[PDB]
Amino acid sequence: EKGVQVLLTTIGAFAAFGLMTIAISTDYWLYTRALICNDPGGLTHSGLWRICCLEGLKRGVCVKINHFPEDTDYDHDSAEYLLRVVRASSIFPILSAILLLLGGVCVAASRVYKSKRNIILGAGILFVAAGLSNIIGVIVYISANAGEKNHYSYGWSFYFGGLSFILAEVIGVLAVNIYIERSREAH
Amino acid sequence: EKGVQVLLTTIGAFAAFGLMTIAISTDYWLYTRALICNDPGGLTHSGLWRICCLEGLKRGVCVKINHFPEDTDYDHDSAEYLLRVVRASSIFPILSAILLLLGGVCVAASRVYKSKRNIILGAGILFVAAGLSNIIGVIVYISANAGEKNHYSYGWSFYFGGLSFILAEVIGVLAVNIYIERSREAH
Amino acid sequence: VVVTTILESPYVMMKKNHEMLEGNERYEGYCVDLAAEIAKHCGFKYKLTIVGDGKYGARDADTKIWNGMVGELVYGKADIAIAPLTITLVREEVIDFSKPFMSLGISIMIKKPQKSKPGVFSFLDPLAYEIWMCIVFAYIGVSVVLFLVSRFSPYEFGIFNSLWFSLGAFMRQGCDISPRSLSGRIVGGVWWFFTLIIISSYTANLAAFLTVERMVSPIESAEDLSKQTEIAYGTLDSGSTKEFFRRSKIAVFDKMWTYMRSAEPSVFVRTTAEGVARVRKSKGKYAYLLESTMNEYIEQRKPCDTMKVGGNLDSKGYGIATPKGSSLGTPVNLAVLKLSEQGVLDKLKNKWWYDKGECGAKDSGSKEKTSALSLSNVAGVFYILVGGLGLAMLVALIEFCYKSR
Amino acid sequence: VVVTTILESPYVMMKKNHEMLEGNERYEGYCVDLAAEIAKHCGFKYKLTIVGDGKYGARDADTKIWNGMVGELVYGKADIAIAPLTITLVREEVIDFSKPFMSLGISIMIKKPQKSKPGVFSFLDPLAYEIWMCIVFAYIGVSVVLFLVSRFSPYEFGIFNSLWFSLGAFMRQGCDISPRSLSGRIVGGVWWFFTLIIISSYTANLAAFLTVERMVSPIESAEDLSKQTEIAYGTLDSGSTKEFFRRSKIAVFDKMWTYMRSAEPSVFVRTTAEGVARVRKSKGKYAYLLESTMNEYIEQRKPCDTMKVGGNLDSKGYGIATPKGSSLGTPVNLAVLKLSEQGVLDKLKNKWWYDKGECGAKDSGSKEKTSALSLSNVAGVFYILVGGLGLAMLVALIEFCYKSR
Amino acid sequence: NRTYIVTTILEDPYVMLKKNANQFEGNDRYEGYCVELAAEIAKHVGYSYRLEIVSDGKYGARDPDTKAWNGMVGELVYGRADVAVAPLTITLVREEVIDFSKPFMSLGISIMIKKPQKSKPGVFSFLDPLAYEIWMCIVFAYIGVSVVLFLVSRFSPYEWNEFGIFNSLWFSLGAFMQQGCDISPRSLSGRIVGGVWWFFTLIIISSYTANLAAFLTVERMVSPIESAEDLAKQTEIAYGTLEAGSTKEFFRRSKIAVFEKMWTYMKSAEPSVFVRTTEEGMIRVRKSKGKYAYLLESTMNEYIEQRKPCDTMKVGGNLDSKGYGIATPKGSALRGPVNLAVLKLSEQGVLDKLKSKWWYDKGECGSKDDKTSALSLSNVAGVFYILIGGLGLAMLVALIEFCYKSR
Amino acid sequence: NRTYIVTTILEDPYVMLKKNANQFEGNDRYEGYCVELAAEIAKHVGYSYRLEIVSDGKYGARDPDTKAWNGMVGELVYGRADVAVAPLTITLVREEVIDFSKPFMSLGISIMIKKPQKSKPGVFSFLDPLAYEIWMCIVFAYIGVSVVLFLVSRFSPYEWNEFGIFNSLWFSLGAFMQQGCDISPRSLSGRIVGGVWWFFTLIIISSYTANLAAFLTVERMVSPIESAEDLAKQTEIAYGTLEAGSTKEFFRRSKIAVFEKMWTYMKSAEPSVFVRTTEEGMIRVRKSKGKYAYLLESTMNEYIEQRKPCDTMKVGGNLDSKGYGIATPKGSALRGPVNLAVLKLSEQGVLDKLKSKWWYDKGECGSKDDKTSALSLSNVAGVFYILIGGLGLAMLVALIEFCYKSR
Ligand SMILES: O=C1Cc2cc(-c3c(-c4ccc(F)cc4)nn4c(N5CCC(O)CC5)nccc34)ccc2N1
After folding, report:
1. Beta carbon of A161 within 6 Å of any ligand 1 atom
2. I want to staple A183 with a disulfide (CB 3.0 to 4.6 A). Which of D56, E157, F91, F242 is the partner?
C-alpha cells in the first residue's frame, strides 16, 4: 500500500538515526592491544572518540585520544593530516545521522501538505547521501587504524553503523517508490 | 559480374597452386648456421626437404636431411615423434596444394554442367581446407625448427606459401559468393 | 721411506710444469699433500714413486700373486702406500691399513636437469587436470540448471542457448541475452564469480611459472630409481660396484642386479669415461653408479652437466697402508686422526674438489633473462583452433545433407 | 712502556668478565689488540692504562696547558698513546704521530628506508602520470574522430554516445552499439588494441611492484643533500665537524653551514646518542654528520635502523702517538705499515665491526611473505566512486530543475 | 676357553632393555644393534661372552687432574673388561691407549628441523589477496551504486525506464564481473555512475590478479636450506647444539669460515640456543615451528625421524666424518680377528641389514617415499562450494516461483 | 739559500705537460696537481725549487740481486735529488730508507665497470613478450576463422544472414580484444567456431600478461654488484687486474677469503683476465659490455670516469687503504716543515680544492647528478603511434566514402 510504506519509511529512518547515534556514542568499535595499559600491550575495547581499557586496576577508567601523536604541518602537511583531521572530527558519520534526521522530518511533514511531492524526493536524496557518508566514514576509520603479527576485532557499534547504512538505502528506495506512485496518481 | 568472378577464381587457384608447389620445391625457406659446413657454424639456405650450403668449396652442393638425429621409440614414443614424422612428410602443404588443384578442377568443370551449383561450394570448401592445412604446416615447420644467441631468417619460399594461403582464402570467399548468386537466381 | 701412489686425479696429477724444475713437485694431488703432512708428523723422508703396473691391488687366483701396490708393500719394493686405496678383508690379511681419511660409498650420477622442451597442451600446466575436469562438469551443470529453472519458471534459455551463455561467460566475451528471473540471475552471477576467480588464478600461476624456473630431479634416491624402469643403470664392467650388486642380498639391490642383467643394450661400460659420456648425451635417460668422490670431482668439472643425487648405497674408506711389522703404521694411524680432528682433511677436500671448481657454487647464476614465448609453447591451442574449424565445416555439411534430404 | 687509551667502543670496552680474573683482559677493544701486536713487534712491555680525564687532547688558550692524553705524552705520565686519536697540526708540533692505521672522514647517517605508508592515489603508481594524461587525450581524440567520421559518413554515434563507447571499450565492459562503417570499425579496433595493451601493462607492473620491494634512499650524496631542504642536518655541538664546516670555503659546505646556522629548531646536539635517536625517531627527516667508523659500528648494532650513505666529506687518519725524542716512534711507524701490508688491520676491522654484527649481512632476508592488500592501498578509488555518485545525483537534480523551469 | 665381559651402554637403539626385563636373564635380557653385532662377532671369532654394562653410564673420557678414564675405556685399560661393543667414537686420545677396530658404522654432524607438514591451503583461500575489509566494502559500494542508479534513473516524472532497482543490481554485478548486461544507461547521471563503477572494477580486479601472482611467485622461490651454507649466511633460523660435548668442541676448534660463523652466532645467542639434552633440542625444534635447527650425530637424527611423532627431518650431508668401532685393550689377542670379522660383515652386507632393521623396520613412522606447484582443487574449492550453493538456491527459488503465481 | 731539485713523474693528472711545451721553460713548463702542491709547500716552507723529472719514468723499486733503487727513491737516497712530490705510495721498504710525510691523499683498490647506459626501451617493445611468429600466425588464424564463419553462416539456401565476411571479421576482432559485438552466431557451426576462437584468445591474452609480468619482475630484481662480495660469489662477470704490480701482490699475499677467491679465479683465468696497461683494461671493459671488471687505484678510476668517453663507472668503497706522500731523504731538514705544511693544507681544505679542480672542474664529462620503474611513455609508444595511424586512416576512408556515394 502507501500509508504502510510511509510508516515503514519513518520507522526505518528513526531506527537508523538511533543506531548511528549509539554507534557513535558507545566506544565499543574495536578490540585490540594498545600499550597504554600495563609486552605487546593490554586488552582494550576502543571506540570512535575515547579508547578505553579492561585489564588491570585501570579497568573501567579511560580517556580520550589525540589523533596527532607525532608532529606534522599544522596549516598544510599532506593527505595524512587531512585524514587524521577527518577521523578525529568524525564529521561523516555525524553528517549521515543529521541527514537521516532531516529525511525523517521531511517524510513526517509530508503527511501535512499532502499535495506536495518533492518532500519524499528530498527525503530519499538525504537518505542516500547518508549512506554514502557512512561508507566513507568507515573507510576513513579503517584506513586510519593502520599502523603502517597483531590482532584486532570489531564490536557491535561497528555493525550498528553498518545496519544504519543498510536501512538508509532501503528507506531511500521506498521513498523514491512513494514519489513514483504519487506522480503516477497525477494522470 | 559473374564470369569475371569465376575467371578470377580460376586464376587465383592456379596461381596459389603454383606458388605452393615452387615454395615446396625451392629449398630457400630458411637462412641460418648449421655446423654441417666448415665455430657457431657456416651459412646455409635451408629448405623443406634438403638443407643446402653456400660457404666454402661446398657451395652449390648439398644433401637431404634426416629429421631423426637422436633415437626415440619407432612404433610410439611421444608427440615429438609424430611432430617429426609430420615435418618430414610435409603432408600438410602437399595436401593444401592438392586441395587447391581439386578446387580449380571443380570450378573449371562448373563451366560445363552449368545447371549444377554444388560444384562451386565444393571448390570453396576445398580452398578453405587448403588454407587451414597451410597454416598448420607452417606452425609445424616453425615448431620443429626450435633447438630447445643464434640467428635465423626466412626466404621467399616461406612468403610464397603465405601468399598461397591468402589467395586460397580469397578464392574460397569468391566461390561462396558465386554459389550465393546462383542460388539467388533460383527464385 | 718410499711412498707409492697411482695416477688418479685429483689424488695424483702431474704438475703443469713438470718438464721444468721437476724436483718432488712433478707430482701433484690430494695424496701428495697428505703424504707430506703425515711424513712431517712422523718425521720421515719420502720420495714420491709410482707403480709401474697402474693396476690396483689384487691377487691372481691361478698364481696367488698380487698385482699392484699390494705387491710392492708385501714384497718390500715400497715402504708405504698413499693412494685412493679401499680397505678390504683380503688386503688387510697381508698388510695393516690405517683408520680411514676419506669416507665414501657408491652413489648415483645423472644429467643435470635443464629446461624441458615445451610440449603441446602445456598451456594447461598452471591448472591441475582435476580442475579442468571439474570446470567442464560445472559448465554442464550450470547450463542444465539454467535450462530447467528457465523452462519451469519463465519471466529463450533452452539447452543450446544456455550452453552458449555459460561458455560466453567463461570467456568474458559477453552475452547476447541475460536472465530476467531471479533464479537465472543468481545462477549467472555465481558462474561469473567462478570464471573471474579461475581466469585470475590461471594468469597468476602462469606468471609464476614463467618468472621462476624450478627444475626437479625425477629421482631423489635409489629405491625411487628401482621403482621405475624408464631410466637406465650403469656400472663399470670390472669394478667393485658390479660385484657388490652381484653378491648382495637386499631386495632393492638384487632387483637392480636383475634389471642390469636382463636389460639391453649393454648397460655396462669398459671405462667411467664411457658412462659419463652416456649420461651426458642420453639426455637424462642414463644413471651411472660410481664412487662418490669421483662423482663430486666430476660435478665440479666443465661442462658441469652432471650432479650427484641421493645418499650412498654403501660405506667404504680409503686407507693408508703399511707392510706388516712396520713401525710407521702406528704413527700414521695417529697422524690421520690428528689431521681429521684438526681439520686438514676437510680443507684439502675443499681444496681439490670445491675450490678449483671449473663450475661455480650451488647457484652461480639467477634471474636469467626471461625468454619471449615461442610458438612451441602455444602451438596446441592453434591445433585445437584448426580442428574446431574443420569440425564446424563438417557439422555444417552434415546439416546441409540432412535437411536437403 | 705504559700505553694510554680511552673508553670508546669498539676501541676500548671493559670485558664482560672484568670482575673475575681481570689481569690485562679487563680492557677490550680494537686498540687493545693493536697495542698487543705492535708491542710484540717492538718487543716492549705494556700495562694498559686509561686517562683519568676522559677528554681528548686539547689545549686551553687562557692557560697554555693541554687536556687529555696529549698532556700525558708531553708531560711523561704516559710513554705512548693508542686511541682513536686523529692526526692534526697542533698536536704534531709537540708529539710525533705514526702513519695512519685507520683512514676515515666525515660521513652521513639516515634512517634506514622502510615500507612507506601507502597513500591515496597509489593505484596510479604502476603507470607514469604522462601515460595517464596521454590516455585521457587519446580517449577524447578517438571519441571526436568517431563523432566526425560518423556524422560525415553514415552507414547514433553522436559525441555523447561516442564518449560512452570509448569509455566502455577501455574498461572491457562491452558496448550497447558497434560501428557499422569501415572507418568507425577501424577506429574501434585500434582503440581496443590500445586498451588491451594498457590494461595488461598495468596489471603486470602492479604484479612486479607487489612481488619485489625496492626501497630507495632519497639521498645518495652530500651535494644532493644540500640541493633540497626537506631533510635536516646534524652535528655534535662541540666537535671537529662543526669547526670544519665553519672554517670551510667550498660552496656546498658553506651552504650547509648557512642552513645549519639559520635553521630551527636546533639541529645541533650535545651527544651523538641524541643525534642517532633523532634520526631513528624522526622517520627519515633527520641526517646526522659524524665520523665514518662510528657510523659503520652503529649500522651493525641493533635495532639496525640506520645506514651510512654516500662517500666521505673529508680525509682524516687515526695515529699512534709517541713523545718527541722517543725510540719507540720509529718501530711503531714501521709496525703499523707491517700490519697494513700483511692484512692484520683489515681483519680487526672485520672483527669488531662486521663480525659481532648484531645485524646481519647486506641482505639477511629476502622474499618476505607478501601481505594481502589493505584498504589503505585502494581507498582512493573508493573516494572517487563516492564522489562520482554524489556528482551524478547533483547533475540529475540540476537537470530536473532546468527542465521543470 | 673362558668367557669375555663385553662392555656396552644403554643408548637406543644400539642397546635396549627388552620388553620384559624381569623375566629374562643373561645376554638374552637385552636387545639392539650392538648385541646382535656382538653375536655375529662371537660366531666368527668363536668365543662366549657374558654381557655387561658400564655402571657410570658414560663414554670414555679422562679427567685432566686425576688422569683417570671415566667409562668404557676405563673399564678396559684397567682390566675390568675385555671388550667394548658400543657407539664408541674413534678419537686420538682413545686410540692412544686402546685398540680400535675398523669402523663398523660411519656418521657425522648433521641437521634436524621440523618436517615440512603437508600444507593445508584452506577453503576460502582465494580471498587472501584482498583483505576481508575490501570485500565487504565492495559489497556495500555495490549496494550504494545500485540504489543511486535506480534513483537517478527513476526520479523524474518525464519518464512517468528499464533501470529499476532489480535491474540496477544486475547491471552493477555484471559490471563488477567484467561481463556486461543487455541494458545500459542512456542519461548522463547513469553513465557517470557506470563509468566510475567500471574504473573501480578495473582497479580491483587488476589488484587481485597482481597480488595473487605475487603470492604464488614468492611461494615458488622459497628455498629450504638443504645445507649449512644456506643455514650460515641466513640469520632468521636458529641453529643450536648441546651445551657441552663434541659438537661444541668441533665448532670451537673449527678452522673453517662457515663453522667459525656458526660458533660466533652460538656464542652470541639471544636467548641461549644451546640445550642440555637431545630430548630438549628435539622438543625445542618440534615446538619452534621451523625457527630452530638442531645439530647432532646423524644416527640419532635418523632414529628420531623414525620415531613417534614423525615430525622431524634431516637435511644435508654430514658436515664432518667420524666413526664408531669395537674397542679392545692395548696388546690383546682380539684386535686381529675382531677387525677381520667387522670387515667381513660389512663386505657381506650384514651391518646395512641390521641398520635397516633397527632404524626403519622397527620404525613407527613407516614413511619411505610431486613438486608440480600447479593450482590444486583445494586452492579453489571455496568457489566450487559457492557455485553449488548458488545453484541449489536457484532451484529453491524456482520451486517458490512455481508455487507462487498460482492464480 | 739555494734551490732544490724536486723530483716528479708524468702520470696524469698529477703532473702534466702544458698545452705548449716548446714555448715555456723552467717550472712554468708543467701543470698539474703536484706542481701546485709543491708551489704551496715552497710558499709555506720558504724556498725555491728547480723542477725536474725522473729519467727512468718509474717509481721506487729495488732490484733484489743488484740491491739498487730504480726511480725516485733512487734519485733521493743517492743524493741526486732532495725532494719528491708525486703519487709515491707509502710502503714498508720505501719508508725504511727515506722520510715520508703524512699522507696528502688517501686511496685504495677499487672497481671499474661499464657505466649503465640510459636504456633505450625500443618502440614496439610491447610485442616482446610474444615472438613475432605468434603475432603473424594470430593474424592468419583470424583471417581463417573469419572466412570459415562466413562460409558456415552463408552456405545454405534456406537463408536465401547477418554474418557476412565483413561482419565476420568484425566479430573475430572483437572476440580477440575481449570486447564482443552486437551480433552473435545462432547456428552450431558458428558457435563452435566462436567458442574455439574465444578459448584461443583467453590463452593468448593470459600468456601475454603473464610473460610481461615476468619481464618486469626480473628486470626489477636485478642487483648490480655494488661491492666485491657481489663480485666474488658471482662468476659470470670477469674481474681482472694488471699482470704485474701492487694489486697482484695484494691478492697473492691476501689472507682473506674474498680476495683469495679473486686470486684463485684470476690464476684460473680462461682467457687471461690480466692486462698489461690501464689503457688495455679500460678498453677491454669499454668493449666487453659489462662482462668485464677492472681493479685499479681509485684515483685513476675517478679520472677515467671524468674522461671522454664518459662511459666508465666506479662502484663500491675502496677494498684496501693506502696513502701517497711527499718523500725526503733520511736525515734531512725538510721532514718537519713539509709534514707541517701538508697537515695545514689539508686542514684548511686546499687539497680537496685541487682534487676537485683537476678531477671534475677540468672534467670533460661534466656529470655530477629516478628509480621509479613505473611504465614510461617510451615503453608503450608504439601503440600510441598505431592509434594515430589508425585514426588518420579512418579519416582518409571517411573522405573516400564522402567522394564515393556521389550518385
Ligand atoms: O558506520 C559504519 C560502520 C560500518 C561497517 C561496515 C562493515 C561490516 C558490517 C557492518 C554491518 C553489518 F550488518 C554487517 C557487516 N563488516 N565490515 C568489514 N569486515 C566484515 C567482518 C570483519 O571482521 C572483517 C571484514 N570490514 C570493513 C567494514 C565492515 C560497513 C558499513 C559501516 N558503516
Report:
1. yes
2. E157
HEC secondary structure over A101-154: HHHHHHHHHHCCCCCCCHHHHHHHHHHHHHHHHHHHHHHHHHHHCCCCCCCCEE
Looking up cell 662468476 gives F235
H-helix segments, E223-379: 229-233, 246-252, 257-267, 278-288, 298-305, 335-347, 350-356
Domains within chain D, CATH numbers bracketed: 2-103+317-354 (3.40.190.10), 109-114+216-314 (3.40.190.10), 122-213 (1.10.287.70)
Residue F164: Cβ within 10 Å count: 14
What gap in Å lies between CA E326 and CA E335, rounded to an integer? 9
Q: Is E246 annotated as a binding residue?
A: yes
Which parts of chain A are beta strand (E)? 30-33, 43-46, 153-154
CA–CA dist D184, D192 (Å, integer)? 12
**Longest CA pairwise span in chain B (Å):** 73
**Total of domains in chain A:** 1
Helices A156-185, E132-153: axis angle to 10 degrees equals 10
Q: Please tell me whether F247 is known to bind a ligand.
A: yes
**Among E residues 189-208, those touching chain D with beta carbons less than 8 Å apart:** 189-204, 206-207
| CATH code for position B179 | 1.20.140.150
Q: Is D172's CB within 8 Å of C174's CB?
A: no
**Minimum distance, in Å, between the CA of residue C380 and any CA atom of chain F:** 10
Selected residue of D93, D142, D180, D193 to mutate for chain F interface (largest F Cβ count, 10 A): D193
Which secondary structure element, helix H or strand E, spans residue E175, and what is its range?
A: helix E165-176
Cell of A125: 536524496
Domain hosting residue B69, numbered range = 2-185
Annotated binding site of D for L-glutamate: 84, 86, 91, 240-241, 291
Out of A142, A162, A169, whose CB is closest to E144? A169
Say if residue A126 is exposed, middle or buried (CB neighbours under 10 Å; 0-12, 13-18, 19+). buried
> What is each CA distance from A35 to A38, A78, C187, D281, E199, in whole angstroms?
7, 27, 49, 18, 41
Q: In sequence order, what E strands does D267-347 have?
A: 306-308, 316-318, 321-323
Asked if residues A88 and A146 have their Cβ atoms less than 8 Å apart, the reply is: no
Task: Output the CA D375–ligand 1 centroid distance in Å.
Answer: 13
Query: What is the experimental resolution, given in Å to one decimal place?
Result: 3.2
Contacts of C332 in chain E (CB under 8 A): none
Q: How was this structure determined?
A: cryo-EM
Residue C101: CB atoms within 10 Å: 25
Crossing angle of the two packed helices D182-211 and F165-176, in degrees rounded to 10: 10
* Helix (H) or strand (E) run with residue A182 in it: helix A156-185
From CA C3, how far away is CA C51, in angstroms rounded? 10
Do residues D85 and D316 make contact, with C-beta atoms less than 8 angstroms apart?
A: no
Buried b (16+ CB within 10 A) or exposed e, A139-156: bbbbbeeeeeeeeeeebe
